[PDB]
Design a binder for these strands. Structure first.
Ligand SMILES: [Cl-]
Ligand SMILES: [Cl-]
Ligand SMILES: [Cl-]
Ligand SMILES: [Cl-]
Ligand SMILES: [Mg+2]
Ligand SMILES: [Mg+2]
Ligand SMILES: [Mg+2]
Ligand code: NA
Ligand code: NA
Length: 326
DNA sequence: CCGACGCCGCATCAGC
DNA sequence: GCTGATGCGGC
DNA sequence: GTCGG
């Protein structure tokens, strides 16, 4: 947090461009800049020093100059005062309300939490669960609670079929002392890129976790991706734990390493790494790494037996999960 | 200057 | 019903 | 908004 003021500034600018301007590349530009500055191991003392980092250019350098000189940014101050922009920014904090729905709601005069509750019939299902648990979803999850949740998921998955392997990813696997949610990668030997030998592989797991009242709501659910809500059990007389977002991703067993690379993140690390892959002539998704031909079409999956193999292909030194928190 | 900016599952909608 | 585009959130 | 070519 050497430069927390600066990176906070860039994040709020990024959120503005995404939520209000719907300018996604500006959002990505600000987030890359914030990320490279949070990496930087000195207290930044000027915008020229910052412009030496990749992703910081002339515009951000000047903003950093204003911020260091005054402690504020007039642009953000103007944005914070505009009622319409502040309202759009707020509604996007509800899960399932993005920039488009937020501006549609505000255009219809729905601008506050109370407005949302009054108009819950204007929400799709995801948005309704996001409003229902609005306050809980803002809370972080201490790693100790993540540890308890991991124990439940892995033991309940083992009860369904001892051949499942569930791996907690996201920030948990990167070693964070708190997480925004719980990310679970699931494999089963009956589900490979070659064949799906058993139906209902994700559903069986989701159903078991609902059965024992760990999973409480569903935001979306398909054959390979579940997004919903869970809650640790509490003791007699004890306040309830907050409800938590849980994501479960069933990945073909022979594609585990690409999957766990993707699900470990961070999001900015994945963008950086996939971008670097393109410059080296490969393309990376959560299933495979493939070479790009001279015409730029993806060739056949390359063999992968470890996360490091993927690093090796694009000529990166290996980075432990704990060092992928960009 | 200028294109290119990571890649994708699910929910929802338009158009047929 | 399907297919294709769009919104959204995932890392 | 930034940047490589
Ligand atoms: Cl943009
Ligand atoms: Cl400010
Ligand atoms: Cl793999
Ligand atoms: Cl693929
Ligand atoms: Mg997470
Ligand atoms: Mg996240
Ligand atoms: Mg998640
Ligand atoms: Na720079
Ligand atoms: Na949202």
């Amino acid at each position: 947090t050497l430069n927390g003021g600066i990176t906070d500034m860039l994040t709020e600018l990024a959120n503005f461009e995404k939520n209000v301007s719907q300018a996604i590349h500006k959002y990505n530009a600000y987030r890359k800049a914030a990320s490279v500055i949070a990496k930087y191991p000195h207290k930044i003392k000027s915008g020229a020093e910052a412009k030496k980092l990749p992703g910081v250019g002339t515009k951000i350098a000047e903003k950093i100059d204003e911020f260091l000189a005054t402690g504020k940014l007039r642009k953000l101050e103007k944005i914070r005062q505009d009622d319409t922009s502040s309202s759009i920014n707020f509604l996007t904090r509800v899960s399932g309300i993005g920039p488009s729905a937020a501006r549609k709601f505000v255009d219809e005069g729905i601008k506050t939490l109370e407005d949302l509750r009054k108009n819950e019939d204007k929400l799709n299902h995801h948005q309704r669960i996001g409003l229902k648990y609005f306050g809980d979803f803002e809370k972080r999850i201490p790693r100790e609670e993540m540890l308890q949740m991991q124990d439940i998921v892995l033991n309940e998955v083992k009860k369904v079929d001892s051949e499942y392997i569930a791996t907690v990813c996201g920030s948990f696997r990167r070693g964070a002392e708190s997480s925004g949610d719980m990310d679970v990668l699931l494999t089963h030997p009956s589900f490979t890129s070659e064949s799906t030998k058993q139906p209902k592989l994700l559903h069986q797991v989701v159903e078991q976790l609902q059965k024992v009242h760990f999973i409480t709501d569903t935001l979306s659910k398909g054959e390979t991706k579940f997004m919903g809500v869970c809650q640790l059990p509490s003791k007699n007389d004890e306040k309830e734990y907050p409800h938590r977002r849980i994501d479960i991703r069933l990945i073909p067993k022979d594609q585990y390493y690409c999957g766990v690379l993707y699900f470990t993140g961070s999001d900015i690390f994945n963008k950086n790494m996939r971008a670097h892959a393109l410059e080296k002539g490969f393309t990376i998704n959560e299933y495979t790494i493939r070479p790009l031909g001279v015409t730029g079409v993806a060739g056949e999956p390359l063999p992968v037996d470890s996360e490091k193999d993927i690093f090796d292909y694009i000529q990166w030194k290996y980075r432990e999960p704990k060092d992928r928190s960009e």
